[PDB]
Each structure stands twice: as C-alpha cells, then as structure tokens.
Amino acid sequence: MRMDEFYTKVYDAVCEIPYGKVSTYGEIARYVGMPSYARQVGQAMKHLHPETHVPWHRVINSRGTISKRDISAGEQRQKDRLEEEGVEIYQTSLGEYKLNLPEYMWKP
DNA sequence: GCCATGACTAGTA
DNA sequence: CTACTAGCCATGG
C-alpha cells in the first residue's frame, strides 16, 4: 500500500466523521486497515493544507484529549474549532484540553 | 545504512 | 489521576 493511498483513505475516513463528533488516531488507523499506523494518521493531518475541507479537528487521541504539537497554536486551533461545533471542552490541572470521549466518540 | 523527530498507544508503576 | 515505557513507523537530513 503506497503512502499516497494511505493518506487518501485516512482523509476519506476523517471526512466521514459527523459534525459534532470526534474520532481517534488509532481508530482511523484501524478503520482503514492499518492498526499500527496511529502516528502516520497524525502525520496525515499535519501534512494537510490549511484551506482543506477535511475535518482534521475531529481527530483526537485515545485518551480523549487534544494532542500537543511542538508549537501551541495548532492545539488551540483545534479546541476553538471543536467548541464551534458544540463540543464541551474542559481544561486540566496540567493544562490539557479534554472532553468526554464516550459522549463524542464516533461509533461506526 | 545511520539517527533524530513526532497531532500515537496499550501497559505499567 | 499522572508519568514514564516499549513498541511503533513514516519522514527528512
């Protein structure tokens, strides 16, 4: 499986995530038939162009929190987007954006 | 080949 | 709950 195919399938899957719901890097990786490619799913989101209509903001980590980038802008950009879709985000003693996974998890 | 990087994760302490 | 691990694997130099 070429990587250009992987990116396309990941993007396909992410576009399926319904407005107001979220999924997981690991889930999308399993959904497209590549259980060990959680990190690569992360790459796929990163490599996206900013003007994309792919809802990358709907893909969080298995712990139900927003992953931290090298910078801090992307993280913040995801929270704002999610809140704009009605997702209730709450912060942490450690300053981690977190949500109720079972409540917002997209279950195919 | 090497190695460092990095939007990950199930497991363990 | 947090923190740190091994396993993980494409990417770029």
UniProtKB/Swiss-Prot annotation:
Molecular-function annotations in GO: catalytic activity; damaged DNA binding; O6-alkylguanine-DNA binding
Protein name in UniProt: Alkyltransferase-like protein 1
Keyword vocabulary terms for this entry: DNA damage, DNA repair, DNA-binding
Similarity-based family: Belongs to the MGMT family. ATL subfamily.
Marked site (Arg finger, required for nucleotide flipping) residue numbers: 39
Note: Does not have alkyltransferase activity. A tryptophan residue replaces the cysteine at the known active site of MGMT.
Site (Critical for recognition of O(6)-alkylguanines, probes the electrostatic potential of the flipped base to distinguish between O(6)-alkylguanine and guanine): 69
PANTHER family: 6-O-METHYLGUANINE DNA METHYLTRANSFERASE, ALKYLTRANSFERASE-LIKE PROTEIN 1
Gene this chain is encoded by: atl1
Coiled coil: none
CC annotations in GO: cytosol; nucleus
NCBIfam families: ogt (TIGR00589)
